[PDB]
Amino acid sequence: RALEVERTVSLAEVYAGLPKDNGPFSLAQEIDKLVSQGSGSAGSGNNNLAFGAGTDTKTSLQASVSFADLKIREDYPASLGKIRRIKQISVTLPALLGPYQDVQAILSYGGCEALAVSHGMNDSGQFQLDFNLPFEGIAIDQGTLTLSFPNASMPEKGKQATMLKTLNDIILHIRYTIK
Amino acid sequence: VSTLVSVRRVGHEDNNTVTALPPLELAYQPFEPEQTALWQSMDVLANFNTIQRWQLLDLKGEGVPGILYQDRNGWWYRSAQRQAGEE
């Protein structure tokens, strides 16, 4: 009684394809800029790459993306269904980790609102992903979805400061329905 | 392998002597891997792994193996090239 659709979002492709005056940038060349120095920003709005503002997240590199700027609602005609809700989001960090290495990353949204990345290879949060209540209420055209890498500052000498410099992309595997 | 290392033309006189030319002698590149075996660190191949989806093979033809990582959506390649530095 639904139309189950998968969508892939490459965040380096999204950040490079921002309009001018919205600050397009390379994700691979602006992560090791922000990791090397203390703080900074990359782009503006919700498609920005910066550090966390609050306490205990000052050393956390947050790569945020907007949902309406992805324009997922244009992938299919509106005649199929005007309701388009997220079913499941998984993260892939391509070629980053070995077989015995780990990444710490939190994929949140502004319970079932956050997600911890561990291996980054079609990685959901869960130890077993069963479709047998993840993400009821989340529309594809509103909100922002950020990914926080803790300890990602090299002047504070955190782990994953050297590891995030060898980062190629950030891939999000959004699954959604068209009911 | 047997390698032909010396060719010589010899004539024999009837008074039991030898008329000989100086020999054409040939030398071959040796395989002495017990002495010349050198170990070198390989930091070029960072995060290469046969447990994950990496491969030493050559796409693009080109005769020298590259490094291919393949996800289910995109493929990442490292073509072999020339160091401009020293040798």
Over A16-44, what HEC string results?
HCCCCCCCCCCHHHHHHHHHHCCCCCCCC
For B48, the closest chain A residue by CA position comes to: A98
**Contact by Cβ (8 Å): A24, A18:** yes
CB atoms A97 and B74 under 8 Å: no
Query: Which among A174, A168, A2 is positioned nearest to A83, based on CA atoms?
Result: A2
Please return the burial class of B68, using the count of CB atoms within 10 Å of its CB with bins 0-12, 13-18 and 19+.
middle
Going by DSSP bridges, is the β-strand pair B6-7/A144-149 parallel, antiparallel, or unpaired? unpaired
Instruction: Look up tokens 């699954």; give the residue.
Output: A175
Give buried/exposed letters for B35-63 (b at 16+ CB in 10 A, else e): eeeeeeeeeeeeebeeeeebeeebeeeee
Phi, psi of B82 (to 5 degrees): -105, 125
Which residues are CB-neighbours of B29 under 8 A, at least 6 positions away? Answer: none
Question: Min CA distance, B37 vs chain A (Å)?
Answer: 29
What residues pair up with A149 in beta bridges, in sequence order?
Answer: A61
Question: Min CA distance, B81 vs chain A (Å)?
Answer: 20
HSE-CB of A44 using CA atoms within 13 angstroms: 5
User: A7, A92, A96, A172: which to substitute to probe chain B, counting the most B Cβ within 10 Å?
Assistant: A92
A163 in the Ramachandran plot: left (φ > 0), alpha (ψ -120 to 50) or beta? alpha
B75–chain A Cβ distance below 8 A for any pair: no
Rounded-to-integer distance, Cα A176 and Cα A88, Å: 7
Structure tokens at B19: 């008329």
Rounded-to-integer distance, Cα B40 and Cα A166, Å: 23
Rounded-to-integer distance, Cα B50 and Cα B64, Å: 19
Rounded-to-integer distance, Cα A41 and Cα B33, Å: 56
Instruction: Look up tokens 């199929």; give the residue.
Output: A80
| Chain centroid to CA A131 | 22
Phi, psi of A36 (to 5 degrees): -70, -55
What residues pair up with A6 in beta bridges, in sequence order?
Answer: A175
Which residues are CB-neighbours of B17 under 8 A, at least 6 positions away? Answer: none
* H helix runs in chain A, sequence order: 11-16, 27-36, 161-164
Question: Min CA distance, A26 vs chain B (Å)?
Answer: 17
Instruction: Look up tokens 């509103």; give the residue.
Output: A142
For B77, the closest chain A residue by CA position comes to: A95
Q: How many residues in total does chain A contain?
A: 179
What is the resolution in angstroms?
2.9
Q: How far is the CA of B74 from the CAs of A24, A66, A92, A96, in angstroms?
A: 22, 23, 11, 14
Rounded-to-integer distance, Cα A63 and Cα A74, Å: 24
Please return the burial class of A12, using the count of CB atoms within 10 Å of its CB with bins 0-12, 13-18 and 19+.
buried
Method by which the model was determined? cryo-EM
Please return the burial class of A86, using the count of CB atoms within 10 Å of its CB with bins 0-12, 13-18 and 19+.
buried
CB atoms B73 and A168 under 8 Å: no
Q: How far is the CA of A157 from the CAs of A80, A89, B24, in angstroms?
A: 51, 31, 69
What residues pair up with A26 in beta bridges, in sequence order?
Answer: none
**Contact by Cβ (8 Å): A92, A123:** yes
B46–chain A Cβ distance below 8 A for any pair: yes
Rounded-to-integer distance, Cα A140 and Cα A66, Å: 10
Q: How far is the CA of A55 from the CAs of A51, A58, A59, A146, B81, in angstroms?
A: 11, 6, 9, 17, 47
| Facing A8 at nearest CB: one of B49, B73, B76 | B73
CB atoms B71 and A94 under 8 Å: yes
Report chain B residues whose CB lies below 8 A from the CB of A98: 47, 49, 52
Structure tokens at B77: 């390649």
Please return the burial class of A137, using the count of CB atoms within 10 Å of its CB with bins 0-12, 13-18 and 19+.
exposed
A96 in the Ramachandran plot: left (φ > 0), alpha (ψ -120 to 50) or beta? alpha
Rounded-to-integer distance, Cα A72 and Cα A138, Å: 13
Phi, psi of B8 (to 5 degrees): -140, 135
